[PDB]
Design a protein around this nucleic acid. Sequence first.
RNA 1: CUGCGAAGGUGUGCUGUGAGGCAUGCUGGAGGUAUCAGAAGUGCGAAUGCUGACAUAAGUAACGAUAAAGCGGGUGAAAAGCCCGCUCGCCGGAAGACCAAGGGUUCCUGUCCAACGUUAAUCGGGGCAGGGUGAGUCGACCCCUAAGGCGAGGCCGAAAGGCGUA
RNA 2: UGAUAUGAACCGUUAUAACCGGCGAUUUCCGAAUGGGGAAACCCAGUGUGUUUCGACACACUAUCAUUAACUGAAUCCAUAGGUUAAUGAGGCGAACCGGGGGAACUGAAACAUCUAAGUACCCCGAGGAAAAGAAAUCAACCGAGAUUCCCCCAGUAGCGGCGAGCGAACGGGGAGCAGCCCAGAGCCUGAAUCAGUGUGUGUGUUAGUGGAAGCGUCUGGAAAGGCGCGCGAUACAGGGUGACAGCCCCGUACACAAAAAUGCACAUGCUGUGAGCUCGAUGAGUAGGGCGGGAGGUAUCCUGUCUGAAUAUGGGGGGACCAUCCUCCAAGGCUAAAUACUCCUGACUGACCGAUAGUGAACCAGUACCGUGAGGGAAAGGCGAAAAGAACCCCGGCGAGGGGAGUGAAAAAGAACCUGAAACCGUGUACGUACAAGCAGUGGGAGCACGCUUAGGCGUGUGACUGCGUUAAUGGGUCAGCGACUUAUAUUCUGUA
Lengths: 102, 37
Amino acid sequence: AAKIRRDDEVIVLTGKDKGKRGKVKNVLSSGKVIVEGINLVKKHQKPVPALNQPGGIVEKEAAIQVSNVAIFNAATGKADRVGFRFEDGKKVRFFKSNSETI
Amino acid sequence: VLKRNRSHGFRARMATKNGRQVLARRRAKGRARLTVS
RNA sequence: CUGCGAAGGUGUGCUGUGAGGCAUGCUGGAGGUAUCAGAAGUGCGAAUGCUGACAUAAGUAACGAUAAAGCGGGUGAAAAGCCCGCUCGCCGGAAGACCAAGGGUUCCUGUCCAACGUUAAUCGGGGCAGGGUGAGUCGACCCCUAAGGCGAGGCCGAAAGGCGUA
RNA sequence: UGAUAUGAACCGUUAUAACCGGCGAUUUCCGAAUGGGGAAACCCAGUGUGUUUCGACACACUAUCAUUAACUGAAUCCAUAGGUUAAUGAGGCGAACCGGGGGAACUGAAACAUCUAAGUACCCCGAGGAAAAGAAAUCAACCGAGAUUCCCCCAGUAGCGGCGAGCGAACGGGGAGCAGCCCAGAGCCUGAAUCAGUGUGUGUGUUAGUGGAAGCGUCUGGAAAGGCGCGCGAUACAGGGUGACAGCCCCGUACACAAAAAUGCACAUGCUGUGAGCUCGAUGAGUAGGGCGGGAGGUAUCCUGUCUGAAUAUGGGGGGACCAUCCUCCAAGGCUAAAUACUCCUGACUGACCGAUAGUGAACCAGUACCGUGAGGGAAAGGCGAAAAGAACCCCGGCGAGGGGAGUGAAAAAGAACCUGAAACCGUGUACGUACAAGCAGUGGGAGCACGCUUAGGCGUGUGACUGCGUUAAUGGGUCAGCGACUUAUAUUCUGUA
């Protein structure tokens, strides 16, 4: 019963990048999600003599709180809450404000 | 080692009731080393 | 009241006889406070009060053969004693070596190493990690026997036990 | 695919992932350890059956004590004891409270030791899930009351003690509780009710949960939950996490709902078993009294070693004894719900108790490090950031540590001894005073000089030559910070107020 899932179109509600849309890549058990292209962090990658020698500065994605993002409605062009309803015995997600199935 | 075990070992403690009480008190306190061995 | 910057801390200024409070700058960056009341683990200079906090004393063990030392080279922050090359002096029917008994990871490879209030060690057996003990005819254990020891009866002794056969 | 702890190799996507709950299989060595022994995590077992390999392989049973059954059976004919086999049960560990069997000191007194402390601390055995007790040989001297325990009055009373300190009642009244039976042994009449055990079905509840409405935007700011203007909802503003203090970004609460299996609390039904009315006996068939010894002491009441023998609703016993007046009361087998007691473990709720020298010993890999033969007592140590991408490259140095740049972040007076960083102590830089200095390192008056103000006004701050007034090396200590030193409860008395 998680509102945010593996493949979801979400929009940032708060933070330095509020309002930019994106797709969630994965969700952490600590109530955090990773969405590509918004929370860029410049990590100084220490060089290693192993098979991989990227070194330099890497542009990674930093996880953000689940509550900081909402599913994009994609029809009203604004963030909307999502709830659960039982249909033919299968639990599904649905928007609000003219709620329609995903 | 021999005298230590025969004086404060597990078998020595359990032989008499008072030693049995000593083991009971150690267990209640939850000591890692119940006895010497 | 409150990010044009809280409380605490460090300065200055004002007020009251005294305990203090209000208004700020700097530091700090997350909640704080007055009036009318109530509830007490509430304020510190000593009880040989308690735990760290200016201090007069620095982590590495073998000084007990009258056979003999010195020179060179390599390593090292250190060289009369270790390793390599050139000599001399003892032992050499053993001061060699291989077995029994006794002893039971000490013998084989890389390492805690720029050192407190001025600690200046000639030994690569130390504490903490990795390997080797390989078997028909090496040996013991397995089979039979004496002494010693033990052991259902009988023999010695009123029983038992001891002696003693299998 | 536990955490410390990144990555890689795998599994899952229109119903066998993981996680949680319930029902099973499996559960070695050591520890009550059951075959024995010893120095607890060490070695060694026996018998029977199957084993493709006739040098094997695997598993069960077997201790002691008590009960029951079977076989054998003395000494001393039979009986009985002992021994063998099978089944069942008992044994150990961990709070508090209660019961049974035993039993101290200190603290108290002007020394008649007893009385108090004390039927206490501690120690031993067993049972229950509350235990003990629990339906009168009892109170009331003839109004009445009717089981036990605990709490609140009578009551710091009446009594008791070298009448000294101390210890410490009944009856009556007002509440919760307010449901009692069987055996001393029977004649007659029965699928006659209820209660128990073993099953099914219905309703409810416990052990994983689902559904679940509701604030957009702007200013300061790197980032917004708060401010200003404007709404909805309120059965829901209960709490916590959520970049700065969040009802309405989320996870949740109230309301409405769920059960494959197991378990618990009420009924009905089927099977088995225990069981009502109408009457007739008895009132524990070796159970007293008396005699002897000890404790609660010449002694009322209670319990018993040995040796005799009559009763008990007909009749036998008590505090103001009198035809052992009258009324009440029935004395040596168990069981007995609940009220009253207790919190080592779970979930929810509560908080003017506590916030890292506090609180439990431990907010934490602390029942630790360390000390000891053993028992026992028992440390220090909390906080970087929203995200640890944690440090590319370059310089000095030893291919370290430490320090100086760049880059990332709002901030590097956040850079692995890392939030805010005090008192005291140890350095650098500037100004002033003292350079054969010592008399409590203060106070009053006052000169010169430096650094800030005032167009001249003997008033900043800091330094204080000289002069006047001026000692515990008879107590502890090198300095400073933090914690702690007249509290809480039960009576009486006094003051003030409502």
